[PDB]
Amino acid sequence: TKVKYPDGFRSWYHVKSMVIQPGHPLENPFGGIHHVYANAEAIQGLRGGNYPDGAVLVFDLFDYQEDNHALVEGKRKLIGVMERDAKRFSATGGWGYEGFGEGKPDKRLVTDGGQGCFGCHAAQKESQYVFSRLRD
Amino acid sequence: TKVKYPDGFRSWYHVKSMVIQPGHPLENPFGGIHHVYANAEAIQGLRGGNYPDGAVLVFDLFDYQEDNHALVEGKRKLIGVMERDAKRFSATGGWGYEGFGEGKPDKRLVTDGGQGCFGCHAAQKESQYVFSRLRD
Ligand code: HEC
Ligand code: HEC
Ligand SMILES: [Zn+2]
Known part of the structure; x- marks a missing residue:
């Protein structure tokens, strides 16, 4: 019961973006x-x-470079994936969690069935474990 | 003669993003x-x-707020638009340039036929006046 690599995700709807900088609690x-x-x-x-x-849902994470008061996207660090399957992924709330290092299909990161990812998203039970909100 | 408002642009393919902070040449x-x-x-x-x-091509511009070393998207400030038509927009290299304040159809920003936008984009003559490049 592995989460599929989300082929073609870069063509999908862009929901939102955020920048996390040094000092922020989620820096690492x-x-x-x-x-x-x-x-x-x-x-x-x-x-x-x-x-x-x-x-x-895909979280696509890039390193950035500071260039004369601009933050410019650098290398892809990883992508995080949540794949909805109420019965297959019922142990972590109906979503399967996986990470791919540098976005590569062969660099699977999650070793604990997604329990660590779920531990944090569980805070969003009310919105079905999703933090992101649609905007305009 | 007028650039059309690009309805549905938020559904389109997300090419790239960038942050421009106070002090950058293009801040204003x-x-x-x-x-x-x-x-x-x-x-x-x-x-x-x-x-x-x-x-x-659409340039979708948001304000941001710095909150504990995260940059979070706030309100849309404007969209910038380039619409290709080699005949109608011949004076500006075959792209028509328009801005829409707050992304609203009724808030047109360009007052000089797009000459001001064109003057800076002319530097990318070699890539058909487009700065952005596809990344993966
Ligand atoms: C808190 C300590 C977190 C841990 C551990 C993980 N995630 Fe998460 N995730 C977190 C936040 C605050 C957000 C929202 C970011 C934003 O821009 O609003 C996210 C988002 C995701 C998404 C996008 C969908 C959504 O819920 O908003 C995905 C696909 C996602 N996260 C996956 C994911 C995986 C695979 C994890 C373990 C490897 C993981 N997350 C851990 C907070 C936290
Ligand atoms: C330099 C002094 C500029 C002026 C004046 C205008 N634009 Fe431009 N534009 C500029 C840069 C450096 C970039 C790339 C930003 C990035 O993320 O790399 C852009 C991009 C656009 C785009 C996206 C397509 C592309 O060429 O990369 C659009 C749709 C766009 N710009 C429109 C636009 C309009 C309508 C302008 C006058 C109101 C305008 N631009 C001015 C640099 C400059
Ligand atoms: Zn400076």
């Missing part, structure tokens, strides 16, 4: 510029509908 | 977090083809 490991993407099924869930199985 | 009026979106026709040009008529 989430420091950098990140972008959140969602496929069609996740949008139904984000819109205030419910999440169909098959919904996928 | 491009300061903030911006995201670049391309429709299907613009992707063809970004990937190395010619840009077809009908190609559209």
Whole structure:
């Protein structure tokens, strides 16, 4: 019951972005510029509908470089994936969690069935474990 | 003669993002977090083809707030638009340039036929006047 690599995610809907800089409590490991993407099924869930199985959210994390009062995207550090499967992933709330180092399909990171990822997202039980909100 | 408001641009492919902070040359009026979106026709040009008529790039500009060393997106300040049409927009290199205040259709910002936008973009003559490059 592994989470699939989300092929083609870069074509998906861009939900939002945030920058985490040194000093912030999530600097390790989430420091950098990140972008959140969602496929069609996740949008139904984000819109205030419910999440169909098959919904996928991606957190795409880049290192940044400071260039004359601009922050410029550098190398991809990793992508984080949540894949909705109420029955397959019922142990962590109906979402499977995986990380891919540098976004590579062969660099799977999660060793504990996603319990560590879930421990934090569990704080968002109310929104079905998703922190991101749709915007305009 | 007028650049069309790009309805539905938020659905399009997210090319890249960048943060421009106070002190940067472009702070006024491009300061903030911006995201670049391309429709299907613009992707063809970004990937190395010619840009077809009908190609559209949008620069989506948000204010941000610094909160405990995170930069969080706030309100949309404006969108900048480039619309390809080699004949109609011949005076400005075949792209028409428009700004929409707060991303609203009724708030047109350009008052000089796009000459001011064109003058800086002319530096990228070699890449069909587009600064952004596809990344993975
Ligand atoms: C708190 C200590 C966290 C841990 C550990 C993990 N995540 Fe998380 N995640 C966190 C926050 C605050 C956010 C929102 C960021 C924003 O821009 O608002 C996220 C977001 C995700 C997303 C995007 C979907 C969403 O819930 O907003 C994904 C796909 C995601 N996170 C996956 C993920 C994985 C795979 C983790 C373990 C390897 C993981 N997260 C841990 C907070 C925390
Ligand atoms: C230099 C003095 C500029 C002026 C005046 C304008 N633009 Fe521009 N633009 C500039 C840069 C350096 C970039 C790249 C930003 C990045 O993230 O790399 C941009 C980008 C755009 C885009 C995105 C497509 C691209 O060329 O990369 C659009 C749609 C765009 N700019 C529109 C635009 C309009 C409408 C302007 C006058 C109101 C305008 N720009 C001025 C540099 C400069
Ligand atoms: Zn300076």
